């Protein structure tokens, strides 16, 4: 059982449930059992068409998730049955029950962390951690600002930053129960939570007098919101973009580039993974797993949905005001989900 | 005789001709005679209000130019009468006949290069050279793309790049005699000259098959034009912005930042000058002067206008389709200008 698309378009209509047969297990091959796989923007964009990579249709959707190794090829010894794995590369097709992959296509992850955390490791904490490390040299006490803070990545940024002794200013969209949301992000380690509406005020720049100007800003919104994010950076600061929409480009005023000497950059985890070794990626995973055991990092609220009920999850993920992230689940759990 | 403004606004109405008296020459002071001074965007923005710095009104306008040292203070020995000087710092007020400055406010420039070239040294070639050096490591054969190529900076970029064995793609705005303009920029060393209209075609990216993708783009336009400039960069390339307008921000698509790993930066010569020593700035000037003697760099077409006829020059500089640059001239010449 697989979630397959015959062409590119709106995932609602484009993607459908189909049945396949599993290939032979060569000496280098690993047969797995999928446990869980998230619906990520990249997955949606790979269905829609506008994404960096596009596999050969008819293709299986989804790029991330976690699977248990069930059977193993003649001469693979680095992966044993019972090991949890995640994809080493993009476009593997993870919205399936079982598959066969070469051992180089897979990366072992420890099987003692929670299943949800394993499934979202790449999109969320891997991305958050990398952005915090790769652009500005941040020491305990330094600040970071970000938008879409209630997102999967946003919540990972909050937790990881706090683990690094950093001080976060967290922008979220305006909403009726901002107070509840504010309090929850603060419990995760957020120092401040402000709305986009608050961000746009000229009196925002030096609003929080008891903390230093951030040299790092993380953006997922674009448009005027990204410009207002830029505006909060110290001189010589960097704003990193890791998501957004086609028709909402990042916008940088001439005066901010020139007089404030700001830098705009992107981050793409897939690119990072390609430019680095398995050991370096394994090192990142271990670091994150240690945070998850030390209690310094937990996964956000995520609605579990069966592979059968993909339609429900596929449309709910494509809310303009994206609520809880949708995790496709291939296992049964203690509480049954119809 | 001085060009003075009592407040900020439209330079046409704001700036006016006034008479002052010259201060005492302290031990550290240098009395000069202004020879020429350009009308630069920064000068206009310093009159308008929206600029990084704003001196104390009533202030003298203009930030750049060249002057001959006429008289010198008790204990200054590094500047002799007859030496040409340019301002070491911004906001000196150069739209004057004579003044008194401290020797640290001035920088000697060789007096054997043409007067026009001395007057525009900072805005034009200093800025062009710095942008070519400070962002991407360019070796002979590498390409650079830029827009507003017919500008003062644009023409300096063309000449300096050619001197460095680089290969330029030069974007200009669409116009009735594009051919004449194309030919002139090519004679200066431009390899290709294309219009903004041509740039916007999807078929532009690999249009010039016989040259490598630029890792450096220089932008002065913003808006959709800057996005199309960005689009021509090799993966990991940098677009540097050194001018533009308030209501024409730079626009960077999410996909270009993320998938192409592009960098957006600004450049401000005033900032560079502050972050570096007099010797390092002197080194830049000497390099440029050597290019000017070697015949590798000449100043563009520039209409000379007397200090008396500033109004004419002040409005002509503020064309939306800026023609020949306006140089305020304090000297008489072989051909008299009424
Ligand atoms: Cl937000
Ligand atoms: Cl707060
Ligand atoms: Cl142009
Ligand atoms: Cl051409
Ligand atoms: Cl950078």
Author numbering:
A (entry chain A), B (entry chain A): 44 to 381
Passage from the reporting paper:
The last step of mtFAS is carried out by 2E-enoyl-ACP thioester reductases MECR and Etr1 in human and yeast, respectively. The structure of MECR shows a bent cavity of sufficient dimensions to accommodate acyl substrates with carbon chain lengths from C4 to C1619.
The electron density map of the MECR G165Q crystal structure shows the structural changes due to the mutation. The structure of the Q165 side chain is well defined by the electron density map. The mutation site locates in the domain interface in between the α helix αD of the catalytic domain and α helix αA of the cofactor binding domain. The side chain points across the acyl tail binding tunnel, making a good hydrogen bond between NE2(Q165) and O(P130). This interaction causes changes in the main chain conformation of the residues near P130 and Q165, as well as of the side chain conformations of K316 and E107. Furthermore, in wild-type MECR, the side chain of K316 is hydrogen bonded to the backbone oxygen of G165, but in the MECR G165Q variant, the lysine side chain is hydrogen bonded with the side chain of Q165 and the backbone oxygen of P130. As a result, the fatty acyl binding cavity is much shorter in the MECR G165Q variant. Clearly, the G165Q mutation blocks the acyl tail binding tunnel, in good agreement with the changed substrate specificity.
